[PDB]
Each structure stands twice: as structure tokens, then as C-alpha cells.
């Protein structure tokens, strides 16, 4: 029943480096980070999978406007990565697509979720993950944390096969607050993930350990 | 696990929104049947087909004695074999719900304006109870508090029944009902159709498209 | 799952309301049987018949010593094989409830005015505990608070017992007991006949009939 | 499910109240043993007999060292084979409790003035933990708060142990302890009597009788 | 259920307190080893023996790089076969914890100053997470809040991990961690030595003795 | 706006002894304790007044059963003690009496109060103090603390010229809980007051002060 | 605005810390006076001048009878004319506080272990009430809860008095008292020192200096 | 009534954002002054001019000793006669704040990482206390909690002082500080720039424009 922690990036190098340190469940991509990488899906998706040692889940986003075109995008994505999770923006056509994909047996995530009812609808349609945009919700004068709180309650009561996968972070604290509200998965962008490697108090505590050790013995080693 | 219903008799709307929303069914009442100009024997099968043969239908008895309500219920079931029969929760309605429980015909208790009235309908055997959220507000109560209390009462005192909240003017009313734990909900057309547009979602998707076009010169996968 | 009871000895009213309400049985007390002016050997089979041979019956012992109360319990059980014996929660009553649990005759602890007294009766073996909600109010206490505390005590510390709340002047009191978790209830006649009319529900049904008429020329299905 | 105890060494009171209260046993302590002037080998079997040969008994060790306390335990168990041994929660007492757990002799941690101390006694092996509610109050703290915390600590961190609350001046202290989840309790005689007999219950039974003799000219059933 | 630990490497003190406290084991850290002036291969078997061969031991790695930390873990395990390896939760420590999870060596994430950092160590595979309660308090934050948050985060998002709170100045800090749900705890010597004597307890036992000798001439049973 | 602590007794020697220790505002008598004292009102009441050194408020209960009889009793009590406060049990006739005595300008207390509504009624009729029987309410299965809480709120919102004067106590904790609920005055029975009279922990702290002082100066005193 | 005190009789420390800390004065007690090994007539003026003639002084009576406590108050006030006299809140101390109020000498009620005790000392006339926060904890209670209740009691029932919390092992205890509304406080030396230096502050000041140096080739102006 | 500040040394940005926002002034620190590459004597009057010659300026001392910081403050006040001097809340900074209050120079206590530290700075005389919200988050605490506690501490215990919260990554952090009561705030450039873009507002206005055009054939008044 462990939580799932994802990297929100398309940057293969960073995924390889951070995979060594973090207990990562996989990588979420979106069209903007794919485009930023400049490499097409059929190139970058296997590269990201390789960068995680072949383990973990990948997510990528459909691009078509109509529900049926979104199903065709899903089929292409799955032909690139057989067990990829298909992200579908939760519009009306997106809801139709999510229902179609549930009928086809292809796992989906409802993305670009700005409110709890919209998120719950995508889960009822069949999405196994629902991704509210926490920081984006804030920026249009709402509360991303409250949306995550409500959405998580609604999924657990009314669509219990789905999880919240919160996205859109500017600080580690936002992600902490989402987890404290029960949200069962999370995808962190690169800078937020990197702010979680510091803690100078830990460094000083290890330094005092070493000073005491090299002071009773003649060693910093064991 | 929750059941989302559409509160209409408009067969065109049912077919359109069946494509978008995860509908569990359609609830009719006398007023939307009438406004549809079509008799039960025509529009009930049209509704059933408009959601692709899956889905639950609900329709309201019209008689005013309990035995008359049982008669109405039998006619409705002969029109649609698995239909759920809405009985307004009056004294006679409670009698009808009791008799129909005996008959093995599933019932919903409708026109509920208060938590205890709703619980009674559930105790008599209704497997759904439908408080009128917005109408409760309109006589100076709180439809949300009635749904909250009714849900608690059903979950500990009549656990076979669900709240099926109805009567909404805004999507937020329905969201508040769901947050209070209400297990099913039926939405009128304009509320469901407000749950379709999201400007910020379209702006994010348009930005995705623009970035994709800047990098790959295309708009497609 | 909840048990709804009628608190009366009036046989004609039990007959009348057993068709409408979903009754689990009837509770009598000394004052109620004395208003009836028919002895326990008459009115108890009549009350049993007026519920269609269904539903449970409750009646109160009159003796003052535990051994006397046990004798009364055997009398009542000889009149109605499956009757539940009401015992006022005094010291002797507590002793009698213990004795009756040893005998295997189900009891209810009645005339409870405080949570601790009620819990003691449940621990003695009573299956139901009956606080007098309104009478507690009149002592300057809070019937609702006592019911709330008693239900928590039973669920934590005597889980084989249920609160069967009694003594009501308004439907709201009974609803408040049910929302506090109280698992059964017995209503006096007037409070039963205040939950059986709602002008808003009749107006709703009337508007439904008006639309049906204005669209099909009939008020029938 | 809850265990109610009497906090006394008075064999007459035990006989008389075991007929009325659903007692699970009797708790003795050195002061009440002394006040009875009878040694343990006399008064413990008297107490066991006054409970009708059922019931759990508790007695306190008197030794000051762990190993002496273990010897006191063995003495106590020779007097009453299934007695629970009360050990004051001092450092030596914690030692004794661990030893007695190894020996298979059920203990109770007594003279508990704080929640951490009580949890320690339960972790060492005590199956009951006995905070002194009123004494804690008298020292400037809150006995109810200590019972509340200790019960939470036991259910999370030593789930084989129960709180057995002791030291009471009013029935309300006992009730507050039970509402806080306390699974067992032991009452001193005066509090136990205040829990029997309430004038409003007697007035209610008297009015029941009086109008049972108004219609019907009788006293009985 | 709960696991109580001593935070020390003083072998004599461990042998002494293991007779009184219900210890689950001993945690060491590099400062406390150094202050003991004995190397690991000497003092770890000594602490194990001083606990009587039962009990879990914990010891900290010294390397700065993840691979060297894995090395230290193997060495520690050669000294004590079932020892838990404490890894400070840095980036390299997180790497070391993931590697050690792959190796099947149980780990504790130590030097934890915030809830998210601790949660990460559990996700990487640590079975225990040790926030420094008082050191968080000293830097202006709240060690109790960090423990409260961390416990919730582990119970819902990393359920195979427990909080093992460390760094205490008062018994009240440890109590508050346990009231927050903390499933294990490691106490420094002075703090363990302060929940070891209670004046009001000794006064109660002396009152017992006084009454007992006023009645039976003697003390002892 | 200091609270008022009263002693609930008519034992003159206990009043003199306990007034030395405690900051008493006065003494409340009732018929039972006056009877226990075996001395008529015209002799105990002046004795109690002097046992408080002349300062201090006195309270005594009427014995008559009709409103006009109670006004008579009140006039007699005021002839004994010019500024005595007249206690009136809150019955229907008691309420009529309190209205009449308000008209007379004679301060009154509504006593034998078992419910918040009853107590508020007595204050509305003109009582300046209202005395719920905390422990008697606890005794018959209710909550004297809740009754004090509700009564205090009612008086502050709806009868602000009146104060709660809580009575009937088996423990000091009941009294502290009344005070924490805002109750503005309290009358303590002898045993409860006497339990508020020693604390071993304080004596241990003082003994340790003395022992450190002796170790440093060999003196024990200043 | 708040009064922050130092809880010491170390003259050198008082002079040092008075330069850093915004102190309103110094509280002495018999233990710290004795540890300084100088009598009152010597050390009190030394402390006064170590605060630069500003600041209030507090000192404790030694006598055990009320008359003796008053006599001690007179000696104390002849040494320091505006000193506040600390009286331990015993029965005799309550008497002494009453007498000193009648004399017009300001008092603090010390060694308060419970909220009602503290309230009594304020009612008797004490301008300050000093609970022993950490010592209340060590007895198994909660010093923080005592301070909270006492502050509420003083504000509604003895408004001329302030809580002056004392007895601290951590700065967090002090902070929790101030958050509870505590209007004055007195810190021992080690807690006082912990409250000034924070490594993260120094790190931020160093980063500021480094940026300045990089942009201007200096660390000044 | 609340005071909104811009946290920058960028003279151009100050002029731009002065046009939009209701600024009360500008806070500088060493890092932003340094990043601007202009000495205090040059950039501080530039900033004053960019604010239209009104509003408050803040600048930080660089010295490490109280006496050094005081002379730094004198230099600052010679550049800007009414400037507020930011002093990092260390021990030396505390002494500096006390001395500067003696000198009548307004100060702000900066680099506050905990509520107690900040309160000390206000008690020493600082008119403003600046916790570093985001930096507190970063080291494992909660900057929002620190702001909340500090604001309560200042309002109860140092009412002449205001929280001036700083260090922000999002507008939400600042909103949460204001909702906790914090009375002043200083925003970095990018957060201030997120607070001037509102897509839904632009959409509503464009809809206004379109309706006005469809009715009057023009877009203006
Ligand atoms: C039973 C219902 O569905 C009603 O809510 C109907 O939709 C309304 C018309 C005007 C207010 S409510
Ligand atoms: C237990 C009952 O059946 C109620 O009728 C109750 O006994 C009354 C309250 C007020 C008058 S009678
Ligand atoms: C632990 C007990 O058994 C109680 O009886 C308690 O110790 C008291 C006796 C008298 C005043 S408090
Ligand atoms: C080394 C640690 O992690 C702590 O266990 C240690 O006990 C403390 C040092 C300063 C305050 S507490
Ligand atoms: C009327 C009073 O003033 C009370 O003292 C009353 O007499 C009590 C009975 C039991 C405890 S208190
Ligand atoms: C009056 C005092 O300051 C003492 O209570 C001192 O502060 C101590 C606290 C804990 C052990 S000694
Ligand atoms: C002290 C300040 O004025 C802030 O700029 C603070 O230093 C930071 C927040 C995020 C990165 S640095
Ligand atoms: Cl049966
Ligand atoms: Cl050690
Ligand atoms: Cl008396």
C-alpha cells in the first residue's frame, strides 16, 4: 500500500541521475516537457524507460482533439510503450475518450484537473489516476491543496479504484501538504525534487559524529 | 462506485450526454415526461435505447391511493422490466412502498423534504431516497444539511438504501452532496452541461499544442 | 436495520398505522394499558393480531421485588411467547434483569433517566435500554445528551444492547436521537401522526398532476 | 464486555451488592484489608464466597523489593488460585511485573499517577493498569485526562492491557472515565450506592402503579 | 506491541536498566560509541550480552558515499548478525538505503529533521525513521509536529515503516510522541531515569504499610 | 472584576478558622446548616458577621412557602443583618417572591436551581445571584458542570445583572470546572475548602529550598 | 507588553546576558541564592547593579508560618526597597499573602503545581502566580495545561494578577507557555542561551557577506 | 492598513511595479544590493526616487558586533534619514536592537527562523520582525506555522511590533500569511509579477466588451 513518487520531466539525463538517489515509481511526461526535450515520443519514451533501468511506469499525453482521435493517440502511445499510462485532459471529449479507453482496457490518467468534481468525473469515466494541477489552481485564485483534499475524499468514497496523482508544484511544502491530505501519488518537477537533497543540519550532525569518532579513535572509517 | 444519473426525459440530450458522462441511468418525473409530449410507452424505450441498452431508468407513479400506486408500478414494469418505481413519500406513498417491497419491485422514495421522511421511505423498503436539495433550500431549510443527515441515517439505520439526491441549480450543490457522502445523484440538463466547459483546461491544452508545434512542426502524435 | 416502534396500547390505532408505517412492534407501559382499561391477557393478543401477527411486543412488570418481577415476567411470557419484558431500572429491577438473563427471557431496562443507570441495566443483561428523553428534559437535564452518552456507552461497553429511546413530544426529538446513533425508538401516537403530512410533498404531487394533465388530458398512467 | 468491580474488602457489602450490580469481581487494597481487621487467608475466601464463587479478585503485594513482591504474589495465589496481583508501579514494581509475566501470574499495575508510568506497567506485562482518578485530581492534575491519555496509549501501544480506573468521589467521575473509553472500573461503596436509587425513577414507577390502580382496582399483574 | 529502546552505549547501564524497564533493545550512534571509547566489534557484542541475548541493536554507518555505507553495513552485520543499520538521510544515504533494501539488510533512516525527508527514507526502504525531536525543537520548529506528521505519512504512504523517535530532554516529549501514535521510541539515560521514581506513589505505599501495621502489627503479607 | 469565594457553612468557629487562611468574600447559610448549628438566626447571623471581621457578605434562606410569607421572612432577615442577601428557592411562589423583593429593593439569590432555564428565570425576576446545585445534578445522572456552563452563558447574554453562585460540591475539581466555565462566584463546603489546604509537592519543594540553604549557610532562616 | 525574567543568582551571568537580552528583571530562589554562596544582603544589591539599576527583583521567604513569612518580607524589602516577595502557596503562605496585601508589599505566589492553588494565591492578593511547569510535568501532569487553565482563571476571576511561568528544561516549553497567553516568564540560564543562537541564521548572514564580498570586494559599510 | 512591500534592489522594477501595486515601500538585503552592483550610497536614494519620494526603505547592517551594527545603522541613516535598519536576530543583533532603540532608530529583526527568536527581537525594540517563510519550509519546518505563532506572540506580548513576512516562492504563501493575521509583507519580483495576471478576468472583460459592441456598435463609453 506504498505511495508512488514520480518525476515530472522528459529530461533523460536528470532521470538517470535522480533515479540513483530517489525511490521513484516512474516518470510523467506532458507535451511541453516532451517538446522541450526536442526528441519525438518514439525516441524519448524508450530512453526514459532505460534511464529508470527498465522499471517503473511511464505516462504520456494524447494530442488529438476528438475522443476517437484521442483513442488513436492512445493506441500509438501503447505501441511505443506497451504498459504506458495514457494521460487525457479532462474535457468533454476527454471524458468520452476515457470511457472508450476503459472499454479498450488501456489505463488512463485524467490530467489538467482544476476542480474536484471534474477530477471525480474522470475517475468515474475510468481513469486510474487523476492529476489536479495544484500550483495552477492556486494561481487562478483557488486552493490547490483544498482541491486535492476534496478530490481525494471523493475518490475514496465514490471511485475507489482511482488515486490522486498531484502535479504542478513550486515548493516541496505543497507536495508535503498534498500527501498529508491523503493523496496517494505525486509527480515532482526537477527543481522541487532537487530542493529535497539539502538539509545542512543533517550535514552538521554527520560532521559532529565524525569529530567524536575521530577523537575517540584514529579514524573516520568504521 | 457512485452512480451518476441524468434528470431528464429529453432523449436527444440523453444520447448526447451518454457519450460524455459516465451515466448509470436516467431519472424521469411527471413534469419532464409531460414537457416531452410523449407517453411513457414511447419515451421510456427511447430513453433506454438512447443510453445504448445499458443503464437504469426511473419513473414516478401518478395514482394517489397505495393500491393505485401498485397498479401504476406494474404498468411501468411492463413497459420497462428493470425500471425503478419512484413513489412520493406520503402516508399513502409509504403504504405503496411497503406493498411494493412485498412484490419484489425496487422503489425510490421521491419528493423528500426532510431527513426523517426520507428514512421512513427507506425503512418501508425503498432502495433509493431522493431529497429535493434546491427545493428544500427554497422553503428556508438547507438541502445540503438534509442530504448530510439523511445519508448518516441511511448508513446506520437503513443500510440497504442510498441517497439519490436531486433538484440542483448549480454543480457546486451536487459536489457538496457528494462530499457529504451521498452515494448517487441525478443532474438536470443545464447543471450537467455546466460540467462540460472549462476555459483553463482548454488554455492548457492550447499551450500544449503550441509548444508541440514549436518543437516538431506538427500538431499530432 | 433500525427498529421503529409504536408507543401505545390503542389497538385500533395500531391497526390503522400498521399499513402506513414500517413498524417493528409495539411498546406498552402501565399508564398506557391502564388508559386502555383492558387486562394484559386481552389486549396483548389483540395488539399482536393488529400487527398481522408480525412485530414484537413489550410490556412492563408491576412487582416491587426482584422475585416478584421475575414472576410477572413469567406471566407475560405465558401470554405472549416471544414478548420482551420491560423492567424499571431500580436496584430491585437490576436484580430482576440479572435473574431474567439467567432464565433466558429478554428484557428492556425502562425509566432510564441517566446514562450510567442505563449502562448498568445493559450490563445486567437487558437487550434494550429506554431513556425517557422528554422526561429527562423536564428534570432540567438533556434527553438528547443522555441518549448520546448512553449509545456510546452501550457500543463500547455493552455491545449486545441497543438504546430504545422513548418519551417524545416532537418528531425532531426522535430524529435527534436517531442522528446520535440510537438504534431503535418508540413513538407516541401524535408524534407518529405528525410525520404523516407534508404540505410541500402534496404541492409537489399536485404540480406533477397539473403538468401531466396539461400534456395528456389525464391524471393517470 | 466491560468489567465493573467493587473497591472494598467489606464482605457484607459485597454479598448485598452482588445481588443488584452486574459485578465482575472485587478489588482489595491494603487499607481496606486493614479496615476489615481480618487477614488475607480469611477475608479473601469470604470475598470469593460472597460473590457466589464467580468473580475476579485482586490483592496488593506488600513487599518493598521485586523478589519479595514475587513471593507475595505466590502467597496470594496460594490463597486464591486465579487472583490478579496488584503491584504498585515503582521501579521495583516494574521489575516485579516483568518477573511475574515470566511466571504466568496476571498482574495489575496500581498506584498509577501518570499516563507514561501506566503504559510502562502495561509494557512490562500488566494486564490491567489502575490510575487513581481522584488522587490525581487532588494533586493538581486531571484524573480524567490521565485516564483518557492512558487508554489511548494502551490501545495503540500495549493492546493486551486494559485501564481499570480506581479512586472515585462521585458517579460522574466514573461515567466520564467510561465515556473516555476506559474498559474496566472499580467503585468504592458510597459511589456504588449513589448509582442505585434515583427519586425520579421511583416517582415514575409510583405513577405507573397509581393509575394502574385507577383503571383496574389492583396492585399487581 | 510498542518497542521501547535505550539510546546509549554504556554496557553497565544497559544491564542495570534491562532489569527494570521493558526494553526492546538499544540504539547506538557514533557519538555515544566514541564516548564509550570501545570499538564496535567490542561494545556491540557486549551490549547484546548485557540485554541477555534478546533485544535488537542499532548502529550507524560512517562512510560518506553510498557504496561505502553499504560496506559499513556489511561489516556491522558481521559483528551482529541481526543488527539494524542506521543511515543518515542524505542524498547518498537515500541511495545507500535503496541499495541496502536490495541487499536484504534492514535499515533505519536517522538524523531526520522534517517529515518529508523521513518519508523519503521509508520509501527508499528503511523499516524505521528516527526524527530528532528535541533537536528540531532547538532549531525553532516543533519536533512533536514533525513526529505527528511523519507518523501519519508513514501509516498511509509507507506502511512497512515505523517512527522510532529520538532526541529527548524530558519524559513529556516522549509521552507526546507516543500520544501522537509513534510506534517506537529510544530514550537517553537521564530521561529513562526520570520516569523511574514518583513521590506520590511512595507516599501511597507508605500509607498502605501504615494502615497494614495498625491492623496486623507487621508489614509483609 | 474579581471572583467571589464563599464558605458554605454556619459553623462560626470554622468560619473564623478558615477566614484566616482563605480570601473569603462571605458565608452562605441554608436552613439545614443553621439547624445543625442549633442556634437561631438572631444569634448565629451576628456571630457569623463578626467571625468574618465585619467585612463580608451573608446569605440566608427564607422558610415560608407563599410569596408574601417569603417577603415577610426577608424583612426579618434584613432586620437582623441590614445587608444580608435573601436566598429564595426557585419555585413558582419563589419567583413571585423574587419579583416582590426586587420591587422592595432587597437583594436576593435564587437557590435550589437544578436547570439552566429555572435559574435564568430567577435572575429575570430580579435575583442578583443564581445557585445551581452542581453535585445534586451530577448525583441524579445529569451534569452540574454543563448546567453551570449553560446558566452562566444565559446570565451573561440575557440577565447581565446576575451572577452564578455555584454550590453543592463533593470535590474541588467540580468547583475548578465551574470556575473554568466562567462561573463568577462559588460557595465551598467545609471539607472541600479543607482539601484545598495542603499539597505535598509544595512542602517537598520548600524542604529542598531549606536543605540547600542549610548546606550553603547552615541557617535554615533569613 | 510582556516581562521576561532571568531565573538565576549568578551575578556575572546576569551582567553578561543583560547586554543581549531584553530583561525586565531577575527572579532568585533559595536554591540559586545558596548556590551563589552569598547572603541576601550581599547578592541582591549585586544583582540590582548587574542589571544597571533597572529591572525588578524577586526573592523567596524562608519562614514556614504566615507571621514569619511576613517578617521575611520585611527583611527582604529593607535590602531591596521595591523587591517582589515570593511566597510558596501553602495554607500559611495564603495567609501571608493576605497579610502582605494588607501591608502593600507586592507578592508572587510560588511553587504552584495546580491551577486552583494558583488562583487562590491571586485571590489572596498576589500580583504574580508562578507554576513550576517542568516540575508539574515530572509528576505526570501537564505543566502546559496548568499554565493554560491558570491564565484563563486569572483573566476572568483575578484580573490584577499575571502568570509568571517558571521551571523549564527546553525553550519549547517556554514558547508553549507564551502561546498559551502567559504574560511573564522566567528562564534559567541554559534555556536562555539556547534561545539566542541558531546556525541557520549564521549561515544566512554568511551567505549575505559572501554575496556582498563578491559584488564589492569587502564585507563592511 | 496592512503594509505591502517589494523585496528588491532593482530600481527599474520598483518604478514599474510602483505604477500597479499599492506599495508601502521597499526592503533591500545584502544579496539583492550585491546583485545590483551599486553601493548603498548610490542605490538607496535611487530607490527612494523610484518610489516617488514617499514610502519606507529598509536596509541591512553588515557588521558582526553590536557596536559595529550600531555604527552601520548610523551610516544607513545618513544616506536615508528615515530608513528602517534591518538587524539579523542573533545575540549581537539583539544587543544592537536594544542599543538602537536607545538611539531612537527604528529597526527590523531579520533572518528570523522561529517564533521565540522573533519575539525576542520585538521585545528588544524592533518595530518589525521578518520571518523567512520559504526558508523555514526548506529546513523542514512550516513557515506558515511560524508566522502564525509569531503574530500571536507579538499581539499578546509585544504589541508595538508587526510581523513583516519575507522569503516567498508563491502568492499563496503570502496569502496564507495574511490570513494568519500577519500585518505586513514583502514580495520578491516574480511573486509580485504573478500577482498581476488574471486570465478569467480578461475573459470576463472581453465578454463585457463583446456585449457592449453587439448592442452599441462600439467598445467605449
Ligand atoms: C424534482 C426536480 O427535479 C426539481 O428540482 C425541478 O427541476 C425544479 C423546477 C424549479 C425549481 S427545481
Ligand atoms: C415514556 C412515555 O411514553 C412518554 O409518554 C413520557 O412518559 C411523558 C412525558 C410527558 C408526559 S408523559
Ligand atoms: C485507590 C483507591 O482504592 C481509592 O479508594 C483512593 O485511594 C482514595 C481513598 C480515600 C480518598 S481517595
Ligand atoms: C545525538 C542525538 O541525535 C540526540 O539523541 C542527543 O540526545 C542530543 C543532543 C542535543 C540535544 S539532544
Ligand atoms: C443545598 C446545599 O447547599 C448542598 O450543600 C447540598 O446539601 C448537598 C448534598 C450532597 C452534596 S452537597
Ligand atoms: C523554582 C525553579 O526554578 C525550579 O523548579 C527549577 O527550575 C527546576 C526544574 C526541574 C528540576 S529543578
Ligand atoms: C531574505 C529574502 O528576502 C528572500 O529573498 C529569501 O532569501 C529566499 C526565498 C527563496 C530563495 S531565497
Ligand atoms: Cl424470545
Ligand atoms: Cl551513553
Ligand atoms: Cl457546616
Swiss-Prot record, chains A, F:
The reaction(s) this protein catalyses: beta-D-fructose 6-phosphate = dihydroxyacetone + D-glyceraldehyde 3-phosphate
InterPro entries on file: Aldolase_TIM (IPR013785), F6P_aldolase (IPR023001), TAL/FSA (IPR001585), Transaldolase_3B/F6P_aldolase (IPR004731), Transaldolase_AS (IPR018225), TSA/FSA_arc/bac (IPR033919)
GO cellular component terms, semicolon-separated: cytoplasm
Name assigned to this protein: Fructose-6-phosphate aldolase 1
Lineage, highest ranks first: Bacteria, Pseudomonadati, Pseudomonadota, Gammaproteobacteria, Enterobacterales
Free-text activity regulation comment from the record: Inhibited by glycerol, inorganic phosphate and arabinose 5-phosphate.
One annotated GO biological process: fructose metabolic process
Organism listed in the record: Escherichia coli (strain K12)
Name of the gene this protein is made from: fsaA
NCBIfam families (UniProt xref): fsa_talC_mipB, PRK12653.1
Amino acid at each position: 500500500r506504498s505511495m508512488e513518487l514520480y518525476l515530472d520531466t522528459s529530461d533523460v539525463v536528470a532521470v538517470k541521475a535522480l533515479s540513483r538517489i530517489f525511490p521513484l515509481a516512474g516518470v510523467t511526461t506532458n507535451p511541453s516537457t516532451i517538446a522541450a526535450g526536442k526528441k519525438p515520443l518514439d525516441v524519448v519514451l524508450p530512453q526514459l524507460h532505460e534511464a529508470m533501468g527498465g522499471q517503473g511506469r511511464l505516462f504520456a499525453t494524447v494530442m488529438a482533439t476528438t475522443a476517437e482521435g484521442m483513442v488513436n493517440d492512445a493506441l500509438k502511445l501503447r505501441s511505443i510503450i506497451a504498459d504506458i499510462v495514457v494521460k487525457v485532459p479532462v474535457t468533454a471529449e476527454g471524458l468520452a475518450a476515457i470511457k472508450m479507453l476503459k472499454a479498450e482496457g488501456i489505463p488512463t490518467l485524467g490530467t489538467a484537473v482544476y476542480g474536484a468534481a471534474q477530477g471525480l468525473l474522470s475517475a468515474l469515466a475510468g481513469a486510474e489516476y487523476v492529476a489536479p494541477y495544484v500550483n495552477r489552481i492556486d494561481a487562478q485564485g483557488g486552493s490547490g491543496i483544498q482541491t486535492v483534499t476534496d478530490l481525494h475524499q471523493l475518490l475514496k468514497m465514490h471511485a475507489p479504484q482511482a488515486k490522486v496523482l498531484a502535479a504542478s508544484f513550486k515548493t516541496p511544502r505543497q507536495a508535503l501538504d498534498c500527501l498529508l491530505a491523503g493523496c496517494e501519488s505525486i509527480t515532482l518537477p526537477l527543481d522541487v525534487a532537487q530542493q529535497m537533497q539539502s538539509y545542512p543540519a543533517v550535514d552538521a550532525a554527520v560532521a559532529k559524529f565524525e569529530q567524536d569518532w575521530q577523537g575517540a579513535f584514529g579514524r573516520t572509517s568504521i
